[PDB]
């Protein structure tokens, strides 16, 4: 059980409830640190979002922050319950394709272990126009608890002027 608290990641809003459905939205907001699979299972055929992209949180409910190439961003992860074994990465995802841009900004082969709950990441110089405006990219923190086959996600929407 864990979730990013800094920077402020995407949270619930109207499009979230509309697109994921009441069952997913209500189950997943009773514990913002819970894994995704349990919400998918409860929702069954009601589910209408991709809960493996930003936990199903939606761009239109949130606002993208402006970052400069080479800028360093401090992350804090509120860790309610550690699970072993497992791995994590923090990467820039292209929201339209659901594919990572370039390399992971940070990778752990064993997560959690404190360079795991309090860490930073650097914006590349190599992004081009790919993140030029809001809603094209986000920084996704992703943790897979292999022991429990549990997925944890948080997103930070951002743009870099190209
Ligand atoms: C580093 O962190 C990153 C994140 O930043 C991690 O990457 C993520 O890892 C997860 C887990 O692997 C990925 O989620 C999974 O994605 C699966 C692959 O699918 C995509 O393929 C194509 C082309 O890209 C798309 O078209 C697909 O989209 C379609 O489906 C989605 C919804 O799934 C729709 O919204 C679209 O409209 C498309 O039609 C995919 O994006 C995906 O299969 C998988 O979901 C299956 O599994 C879950 C349960 O686990 C089910 O709820 C769901 O129904 C899916 O089930 C299908 O497949 C299984 C077989 O596995 C069958 O049993 C089912 O019956 C059914 O056919 C899940 O969404 C995530 O996308 C990926 N994120 C990235 C890359 O950004 C890295 O792993 C991590 N790495 C390290 C080292 O840390
Ligand atoms: C970023 O993380 C490294 C690794 O902990 C740390 O030592 C470094 O000083 C941090 N940089 C900033 C600017 O906070
Ligand atoms: Cu947990």
Protein model, in words:
Strand 7 and strand 8 form a beta hairpin. The protein has three helices and eight strands, in the order βαααβββββββ. It has a single domain, classed as Coagulation Factor XIII, Chain A, domain 1, CATH 2.70.50. The protein is globular and about 40 Å long. A five-stranded mixed β-sheet has the order 2-8-7-4-5, with no helix packed on it. Strands 1-3-6 form a three-stranded antiparallel β-sheet, with no helix packed on it. Helix 1 packs across helix 2. With 162 residues, the protein is mainly beta. The protein binds a molecule of 7 linked components (NAG-NAG-BMA-MAN-MAN-MAN-MAN), 2-acetamido-2-deoxy-beta-D-glucopyranose (NAG) and copper (II) ion (CU). The site of copper (II) ion (CU) has 3 residues, from loops. It is classed as metal binding protein. Keywords: Carbohydrate Active Enzyme, Auxillary Activity, lpmo, AA16. The assembly is monomeric.
């Amino acid at each position: 059980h864990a979730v990013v608290t800094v920077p402020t990641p995407r949270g619930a809003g109207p499009y979230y409830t509309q697109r994921c459905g009441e069952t997913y939205a209500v189950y997943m907001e009773k514990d913002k640190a819970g894994p995704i699979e349990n919400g998918v299972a409860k929702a069954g055929s009601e589910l209408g979002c991709n809960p493996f992209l930003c936990r199903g949180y939606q761009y239109e409910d949130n606002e993208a922050v402006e970052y400069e190439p080479g800028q360093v961003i401090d992350f804090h992860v509120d860790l309610i319950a550690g699970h072993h074994p497992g791995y994590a990465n923090v990467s820039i995802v292209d929201l339209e394709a659901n594919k990572i841009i370039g390399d992971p900004l940070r990778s752990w082969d064993d997560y959690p272990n404190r360079s795991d709950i309090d860490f930073n990441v650097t914006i590349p110089n190599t992004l081009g126009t790919a993140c030029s405006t809001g809603g094209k990219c986000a920084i996704q923190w992703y943790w897979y608890a292999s022991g429990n086959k549990q997925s944890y996600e948080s997103c930070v929407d951002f743009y870099v002027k190209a």
